[PDB]
Design a protein around this ligand. Structure first.
Ligand SMILES: [Cl-]
Ligand SMILES: [Cl-]
Ligand SMILES: [Cl-]
Ligand SMILES: [Mg+2]
Ligand SMILES: [Mg+2]
Ligand SMILES: [Mg+2]
Lengths: 212, 211
């Protein structure tokens, strides 16, 4: 089978190897902060967000995800958008107190950012549906109440810039995903809370928060 | 197909422990964990590529544990049933960048997770290693011994590490865990030749090249 019974972009979470996330993109450094999630962070719509046992302060971060359509090694910024298959709406689910400890102790962010279900993900949005990734409204509601809204025009580092920089450090494979940061309004969730989030005019998704 | 013999071709995730050897310093706190991407794999035949930004590249010879099976919250007593086998690995580290990451309280990504940051030997089936904690690892640079140590010097056992990791991160078929480096970590420069092995089991050669 030489088809999309092999690498279907509509199911990128099933076969995608790597997830790369930018830090503060809405002190900021000369470059975007980068951290990884494992493939097993993916929570496709229908999956709950799982509060880890060790987690006291679970935070939502609505983020635009950029899906790579082809292998990219030191991708030029001017070519970067030729490497994009499309987008997903994502949550960068964060154990915020663990993260405070990680920052303070100079440890890796893995227990804060990389747990099971730490990357809820919408249906695949083909590139065609988004003329301009930097002209979108991201929104997130908890129990029907708006908590984050932000414009992707507010991004400090552009998506072509991010793809380029990341690919110079980490070769990206077909189906790798880059989370491009969260606007203002990040905040906590508790067991049995309902998250709704969307990109205006493009896609919405629902997640319930549960425990292990 | 997805042969475990070629796990680097298709494996999704690499998890690495911090310091797990009691034979050097460069109520026990849990093991530090960090991730490498799939594109960290440098299978034998690949060179190690020094990132442009790197001033102080370090070798870390490590025993890699390959998972055969999906595992969530694996009990320590069951952990070894999830192991398909082993690989000899290098946890290639930009040491100065790591100091910068620690100082700012940022992720260790640029220090630990670059392209080719995980050189990897031929797959060793579990059968060939009755006791993972009774192995000698060694590494030479340009013919000169730099690291040697026993996996009996590990602070946390392999079943412990698999268990702890799986409670935080579900492991897939083909995921790899690097279990730490013995004494002798140190720098390597462009055009250095690395030889490393597990006594009685496997050896590997790598050349270090630049951008
Ligand atoms: Cl927390
Ligand atoms: Cl360095
Ligand atoms: Cl990290
Ligand atoms: Mg984030
Ligand atoms: Mg991965
Ligand atoms: Mg190591």
């Amino acid at each position: 089978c030489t088809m999309a019974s092999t690498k279907p972009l509509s199911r990128f979470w099933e076969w995608g190897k790597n997830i790369v996330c930018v830090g503060r993109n809405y002190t900021v450094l000369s470059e975007p902060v980068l951290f990884l999630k494992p493939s097993t962070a993916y929570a496709p719509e229908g999956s709950p967000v799982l509060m880890p046992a060790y987690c006291r302060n679970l935070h939502h971060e609505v983020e635009l995800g950029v899906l790579l359509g082809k292998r990219g090694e030191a991708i030029p910024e001017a070519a970067a958008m030729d490497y994009v298959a499309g987008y997903a709406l994502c949550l960068d689910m964060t154990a915020r107190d663990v993260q405070e400890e990680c920052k303070k102790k100079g440890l890796p962010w893995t227990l804060a950012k990389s747990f099971t279900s730490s990357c809820p993900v919408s249906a695949f949005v083909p590139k065609e549906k988004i003329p301009d990734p930097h002209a979108l409204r991201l929104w997130l509601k908890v129990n029907g109440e708006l908590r984050q809204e932000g414009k992707t025009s507010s991004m400090i580092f552009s998506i072509p810039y991010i793809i380029s920089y990341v690919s110079k450090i980490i070769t990206l494979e077909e189906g790798d995903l880059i989370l491009t940061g969260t606007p203002k309004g990040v905040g906590p969730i508790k067991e049995n809370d309902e998250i709704e989030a969307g990109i205006d005019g493009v896609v919405s998704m629902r997640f319930k928060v549960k425990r292990s």
